[PDB]
Design a binder for this molecule. Structure first.
Ligand SMILES: C[C@H]1O[C@H](O[C@H]2[C@H](O)[C@@H](O)[C@@H](O[C@@H]3[C@H](O)[C@@H](O)[C@H](O)O[C@@H]3CO)O[C@@H]2CO)[C@H](O)[C@@H](O)[C@H]1N[C@H]1C=C(CO)[C@@H](O)[C@H](O)[C@H]1O
Ligand SMILES: C[C@H]1O[C@H](O[C@H]2[C@H](O)[C@@H](O)[C@@H](O[C@@H]3[C@H](O)[C@@H](O)[C@H](O)O[C@@H]3CO)O[C@@H]2CO)[C@H](O)[C@@H](O)[C@H]1N[C@H]1C=C(CO)[C@@H](O)[C@H](O)[C@H]1O
Lengths: 604, 604
């Protein structure tokens, strides 16, 4: 028995107040009855399906039923209950199940969809501002050294060509700034970038600036408020989106609310009468607690109602401040989204993350709010407390395992294509189709080793991850310099200054990024399409994006040259295929795949 | 490779502010390193494990690590990361995983546990009051007929021996009352019952009374307030718990807040100025909406702040009213728990169910709050918005499939022991050990066909479900009359009057219930123990409850006589076994199991 269904046209279609659901079956012992098991206000419904007279494809039988859209919540969950005289079988995002699937692992479609629909149309680029580009006209005022109290020494200035070292990793400045990003927008635009995610830019003593000192003012070293306001103008003018790093789990210990180094008068660290005393945790004798290992990053206590108001509760809150005029940013990347909470830990985390996302959409209804999840984000996404997550668990780490033999802990990993796709497909199963389309996918970040370094001897697999990055469901994010071949180990060495000298750039890898963003811009199924893994064994993964009549076929081979027979899939029943990238060859259901390759085909 | 771990002593042990975690491995290619992958404030931690010098059992290697209890939230989630030089493997509640388990499918232990710890010590009995027992001294005033407006005719009185029929299914009264329950407490106590769950008892015109007319007054037909207050006294006196049906998704249309039949003056159905107009949904022209198919059961709209206060928000709320003096009930069974919400559907359902549970524990900290979930309750339980659920998905329906060949929809079901246990074990995987211990397990209810009827030709399998009911993790609930062999199809025919004539009672089945409640009372592992399925194939399931040094082995065979070899399991390495129930025989790792049997062994 075989079955096909994707939560997307041609398999679903909205018409009047109805959502039409089609299932495809094929086999010798087809079920005489199929029931669409859908959910309406969390109640399980048995919706009858009827057999369509016309075969959608040779030897395939189509069933159709419908979900009433006038009732129920927007997230339409369903699966298929295949019924014979004596038995049943479930068809799910994870193929066949012999017992009922988990409610939160069904197919799901958001109708109506209230999420940020612009996200799926984007190509993202992550910039660590100190290390991206120095503006042509920066004051040496922005080059001045000061004493970094939390570190115990003066900050260090380095020149763009000086080697990055482990010493003073948080206090070494190469001087990149926001005007530098503005001036490099034409580079970013010819890369295909339509959206920027910036690491923190607010006033802070370290170079990374997660040690926030002032949530209301841009750090002068980056050019201050005027330079970010210009970056807002320039990106708007170029139709680009701009997301800022939201660091709300914790402040820096130089913030005026805490003020450990007593720059001012009212800080909570050394004053029991401080207005912000209840925004931080203290020992019974009144000594401020460290957060994890960090004196520099005291944790904010969302037990306090006034803290709740300051961050997201009130109209004057930090979360809404940067979303209205004049800043009008497009949303927030939430740092440490999973640990924010009350009493020094993640207590009531889900309530506060929801409160933040809600406050964002009050100020700006199409605001994009997504959180950094090294871990399993499914509970957050399944309760809709945020729009998306940095998809380390659903995308990054499966590719670390399959291509680079490592994982989140940099432990040995040995997983073949079957395991890799069961992993990636199991993660998506917890997400609606509209959620899958906006998952924030990347290969590395400011908080990981460079993916190119993680490949080691297998660095020739890097072009595979690039193609995969642009073709797996979700919005892709390029970590700055990845595209020109920047490498390095984990923090601090993953934050090398961008090599603007072309002699220091992998020009071929950069072109591959350019072509892939063009393909994604060009073809709807790479932005809106369902996704069916078709073959996943040993070294070879083959999947197809599916949107209406269009198909995009992707074949990734991490190992030696081989041939892979694709059994006649009704998803691949098209007029013909046009190869768009890679040197693979499809002919008569046989994929001839060269060693260590990734190929993309468009249906013609 | 083989592994064992249960979230219970001997595998875990609290000592100082530390939780010690032990894993057992056995095989030819053991991992030289194992990492305890635990969670602290949602952050994934790699806690090293070390090899113990002493083998817990022959050919078994023990690893140990520890979770720091001073930090993190009470729910300690973890799994095991087996590490070799070139690869890794995960050990989980669901055996080995090749890619990381879901965060909410790890092992989990609640330390500290704030749940109702008395629940695991109970045997529950569900009573539909009209059909249980008429008190020796009931007024014929309680026998009077009235007109049931929602039905269109007078209620009907029947005698205890009159056959139950489909006519007037909601308006036919056999006259059982609360004093009748009181007078039958000695029967219930010699059955082993320690706790009662009553279907609704508040003033309502139907016989089932989910059409609530007055949340503050007991229906006179059941004996009114004094009869329930006596039932409170009598159960307290006998050390028994008392749970009431909480019907808060919807009221009856005869309630004064709605008042469709205009008994009074201010109802919301026919008065736009009504104080409760915003507690119900109306068409733009102001006509009250039906809920699902029901005019009689208008849905309550938790959008309204004053409704929130009336039900659970205020100190005078319905939820807290019955939990303080003089009522001092032990908690609430929440009817339609999954659909309660705002605007006519389940919008913000999770917030309101949590609000209800919170209000219960304000009034009464060890209150038990659990909801009727025909569906998958995992999201509710995983967010802790309730203590437990009627475990239809985790217990009832797997036993319907494996023993009775049917399911929630009364569709044909054909599932063997492998599928049945993968199903039951997958559900539990989403639940902490303390949550598993308080899942509300039963074989049928007032809302299903009688399980004995569902077995059909295979009714001889009924004793298997009984033994299973008392030995699978969770608190068992007997649906009244099940124990004496009452049968019948779905509602109305599942609510037959209890046969108090012994000539109409299955005396053997009643004794089996008596013995099983005694075993459960006697042996700690049947109330607190972990649970490891040991064998699950074809007709045979074998599992063991595990608590400290004690073991309870259960072997269920739904089919022909057979022998089952139990490979040497270190969980079964004991001095010897004492057979307590059933005619199975264990000798030298070989189970001789007669046709259609269930057997229980205690370790000696
Ligand atoms: C002092 C450090 O500040 C930053 O790191 C913070 C920040 O809030 C965030 O990046 C957080 O990131 C991750 C997730 O929260 C975890 O889920 C994941 O498992 O681990 C991630 C990173 O650990 O981590 C920090 C809060 O826990 C900044 O990004 C870092 O560079 C930090 N390091 C300082 C200090 C050292 C001293 O040796 C230097 O190596 C480094 O270069 C400095 O910048
Ligand atoms: C009118 C009916 O009132 C009661 O049923 C309600 C009640 O709130 C609750 O039992 C609810 O139960 C279930 C769950 O909510 C669902 O998840 C599950 O899938 O379906 C369950 C039962 O349908 O169902 C009702 C709210 O939807 C009372 O228990 C019933 O007896 C009801 N029936 C009346 C009416 C008919 C007319 O033919 C008679 O057959 C019956 O004997 C009457 O009592």
């Amino acid at each position: 028995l075989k079955a096909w269904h994707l939560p997307v046209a041609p398999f679903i279609k909205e018409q009047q107040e109805r959502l039409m659901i089609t299932l495809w079956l094929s086999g010798d012992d087809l079920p005489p009855r199929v029931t669409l098991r859908a959910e309406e206000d969390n109640e399980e419904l048995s919706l009858p399906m009827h057999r369509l007279r016309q075969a959608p494809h040779p030897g395939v039988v189509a069933w159709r039923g419908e979900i009433n859209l006038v009732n129920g919540q927007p997230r339409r969950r369903y699966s298929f209950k295949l019924l014979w005289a004596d038995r049943q079988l479930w068809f799910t995002p994870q193929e066949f199940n012999r017992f009922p699937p988990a409610r939160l692992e069904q197919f799901a479609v958001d109708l109506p969809d209230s999420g940020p629909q612009w996200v799926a149309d984007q190509v993202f680029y992550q910039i660590f501002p100190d290390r991206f580009a120095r503006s042509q006209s920066r004051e040496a005022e922005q080059d001045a050294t000061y004493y970094h109290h939390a570190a115990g020494h003066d900050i260090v200035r380095k020149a763009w060509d000086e080697p990055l070292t482990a010493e003073a990793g948080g206090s070494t400045f190469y001087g990149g700034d926001l005007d530098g990003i503005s001036e490099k927008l034409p580079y970013l635009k010819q890369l295909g970038v339509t959206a920027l995610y910036l690491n923190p830019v607010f006033v802070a003593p370290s170079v990374h600036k997660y040690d926030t000192e002032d949530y209301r003012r841009v750090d002068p070293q980056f050019g201050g408020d005027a330079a970010l306001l210009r970056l807002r103008h320039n990106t708007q003018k170029e139709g680009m989106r701009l997301i800022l790093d939201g660091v709300f789990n914790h402040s820096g210990d130089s913030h005026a609310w805490f003020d450990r180094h007593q720059r001012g008068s009212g800080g909570a660290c050394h004053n029991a009468d401080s207005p912000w005393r209840d925004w931080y945790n203290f020992s019974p004798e009144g000594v401020a607690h460290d957060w994890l290992g960090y004196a520099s990053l005291p944790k904010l206590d969302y037990r306090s109602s006034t803290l709740i108001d300051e961050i997201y509760g009130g109209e004057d809150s930090v979360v809404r401040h940067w979303l209205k005029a004049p800043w009008s940013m497009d949303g927030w990347r939430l740092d440490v989204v999973h640990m924010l909470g009350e009493g020094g830990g993640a207590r009531n985390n889900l309530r506060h993350i929801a409160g933040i996302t809600q406050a964002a959409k009050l100020e700006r209804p199409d605001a994009f709010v997504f959180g950094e999840h090294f871990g399993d984000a499914r509970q957050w996404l399944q309760a809709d407390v945020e729009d998306s997550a940095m998809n380390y668990r659903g995308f990054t780490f499966p590719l670390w395992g399959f291509l680079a033999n490592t994982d989140i802990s940099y432990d040995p990993q040995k997983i073949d294509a079957q395991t890799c796709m069961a992993w990636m497909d199991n993660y998506r199963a917890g997400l609606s189709h509209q959620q899958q389309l906006r998952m924030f996918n990347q290969l590395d970040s400011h908080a990981t080793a460079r993916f190119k370094s993680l490949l080691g001897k297998d660095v020739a697999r890097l072009p595979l991850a690039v193609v995969w990055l642009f073709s797996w469901p979700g919005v892709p994010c390029i970590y700055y310099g990845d595209e020109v071949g920047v490498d390095g180990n984990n923090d601090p060495f993953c934050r090398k200054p961008f090599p603007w000298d072309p002699a220091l750039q992998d020009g071929d890898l950069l072109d591959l990024y350019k072509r892939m963003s063009k393909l994604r811009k060009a073809h709807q199924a790479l932005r809106y399409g369902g996704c069916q893994v078709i073959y996943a064994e040993d070294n070879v993964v083959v999947f197809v994006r599916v949107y209406k009549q269009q198909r995009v076929l992707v074949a990734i081979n991490r190992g030696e040259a081989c041939e892979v027979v694709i059994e006649d899939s009704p998803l691949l029943d098209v007029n013909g295929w046009q190869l768009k990238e890679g040197a693979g060859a499809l002919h008569d259901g046989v994929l001839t795949l060269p060693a260590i390759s990734a190929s993309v085909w468009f249906s013609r």
